[PDB]
Symmetry: C4
Subunit: 177 residues, 4 copies
């Protein structure tokens, strides 16, 4: 069944997203989530829903940890959602995005890359658009510099406090089935 | 006990309607519903509610599939709700509506025919009214051409994102008890 | 423990009130409630809540049914909530209110009489006030004519679609503890 | 694991806060909470949340009751949340706040003192600010008079009817981990 990864720096909102979208958590409650220290493999198995697996990662996985066979993980992955906290400085997020998608694409160029520009409830509508544009351009420029123009990133403006996170996650799922 | 069918093209919103109205699903969650591949017979049995059965059909049932005795099904049916996605082109929906209600009426002319012009949260109020008028007129004209003027269609403007789907489904139930 | 009765004509909203306030029912779902045909004794027993019993009656109890010892019921009752559908004609409701409270007061003049002018979500704010005034004056005039000036009615404007039903029911409970 | 106390006069909203934030209670339902007569020790233990213990106290603990070793309790306490009903007169609340934090600080000067100026949904925004200022100044002046300038109070404007209670409680938790 399709496997979707949730990756991104600590505090970007990965666990909140899976809890709100798939486990009926109120967004307000997500403030009390513990920081994630083990990969959590969430089987969306209910007989009425599309069936797929979501892997909620600890933020900022260490690609040098020999416990983690990232190549094997990526070869079995249909989509990688990279979550960026739009309310915070995102230069490190952009660096880690690049490292992550370049490693994934090299082993599975059929993977879909989905960038959630997240926590946008804290931004004005115009600033959401400017933030997406800056992220889009910087991320694509980094890809171009590395000879990875053919690696396509899709961008989404998301918040757990409205419909947008559900719409975004649904678009990601629908591409895989 | 009364039997109500949910029919309509794939993606019209049948399963969403039954989940939101009768199973406490958030409308946002319905984005992740699987396409329905078997008739689901939902017994509304709770001791505090009106008791009736809802049959959630796969979209666009094949009237030529010999596994399905539609005449027998219709003879035991009190109401047929035909769901139309108002945000999409509805010419095929209108064709299939006509085929469906004409077949049902021929075996059970006491059946109530209930047309949910659905997903109206994506329409302006004026466009909702124009869409209902166009559907109403086209559907009635098709009935007239087939000599089925006495077959009455009732029309409802519905969305899972507000009270309207509950109000509509309640009106359908109340007519049967 | 305190006993509170819910009485009123059929369809006034008695069962909706108890379901929404004490059983987490969405107001939208109450459209599908069956008409009540037996007294339902609801023990509010949760260890965190005030403990009391709510008796949800069939609408328009028959005072002439010899199965029902209304005097005994009233002698054990702390408050009687009489629910009136504000969206409907309320002349019969006023007649039945009078009959009900006069019978109750005669056996238990310590009972509290609480009139919920209900379903006010369908009224303008000014019309809510005029409706309460008309009900208040008519009900008190009927009491005066019967020599029951000392029987006090309290009036509340309520809806299951907002905080008002909770506020009203809380006021009734607080008077008893 | 961190221990957080909820203290404050009766009816200030302590139990409502813990129920709404940590037990999915609707704010409307909190109207029916019983007055608390025993300390309730609530272990926030879910494997996805920060793990800590909340002690919901009866309002206005009696420091002279020999059943209660307040010094021992305070020595094991990371934060003390003192809840003040902003809609009510708060002179007694301020007196009891002072007594409480001075006793706590004397045995555990590392404790965090968190004052929730609560029920602010009943105040205008400007009156919220003036109420916080008056409470802040009066509380600090009392500390200064007692030679307790180094005892720091943090102030929060909270309501169970919006995000503010969640935000406030989250800030308190985050300071402890
Ligand atoms: N304003 C706002 N805050 C959000 C949003 N999504 C998550 N948060 C907040 O962001 C914080 C961190 O969320 P969390 O899901 O734990 O992040 P994470 O990416 O799983 N962290 P880790 O990698 O350490 O496990 C929480 O306080 C949460 O409520 C959002 O859309 N808007
Ligand atoms: N905007 C909007 N979308 C809706 C509404 N009702 C359903 N949807 C969406 O329509 C899509 C299809 O819904 P679904 O209930 O699976 O349709 P179905 O008619 O059961 N399909 P099938 O016949 O294949 O089983 C979902 O993404 C769902 O969220 C509505 O009122 N508004
Ligand atoms: N608009 C609106 N409708 C309401 C309100 N309360 C209840 N209703 C509706 O009124 C109808 C009847 O409700 P119900 O609770 O069954 O009434 P009842 O007084 O228990 N009837 P019976 O005496 O026959 O058992 C339902 O369709 C319900 O949704 C309200 O505050 N506003
Ligand atoms: N308007 C409003 N009312 C609130 C708020 N928080 C609590 N309340 C109300 O305040 C009342 C008392 O709440 P409760 O939680 O029992 O208070 P407590 O401090 O635990 N009392 P005790 O010390 O006796 O146990 C309830 O009616 C509750 O609904 C709030 O933010 N706003
Ligand atoms: Mg996490
Ligand atoms: Mg379906
Ligand atoms: Mg009833
Ligand atoms: Mg309490």
């Amino acid at each position: 069944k399709p496997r979707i990864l949730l990756m991104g720096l600590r505090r970007s909102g990965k666990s909140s997203i899976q809890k709100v979208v798939f486990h009926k958590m109120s967004p307000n409650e997500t403030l009390f989530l513990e920081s994630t220290n083990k990969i959590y493999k969430d089987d969306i198995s209910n007989s009425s829903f599309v069936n797929f697996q979501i892997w909620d990662f600890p933020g900022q996985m260490d690609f040098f940890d020999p416990t983690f066979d990232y190549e094997m993980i990526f070869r079995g992955t249909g989509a990688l959602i990279y979550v960026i906290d739009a309310q915070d400085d995102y230069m490190e997020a952009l660096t880690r995005l690049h490292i992550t998608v370049s490693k994934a694409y090299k082993v599975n160029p059929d993977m879909n890359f989905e960038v959630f520009i997240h926590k946008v409830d804290g931004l004005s509508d115009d600033h959401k658009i400017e933030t997406q544009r800056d992220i889009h351009q910087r991320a694509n420029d980094d890809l171009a510099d590395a000879g990875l123009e053919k690696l396509h990133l899709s961008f989404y403006l998301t918040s757990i406090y409205d419909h947008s996170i559900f719409e975004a996650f649904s678009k990601v799922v629908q591409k895989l089935i």
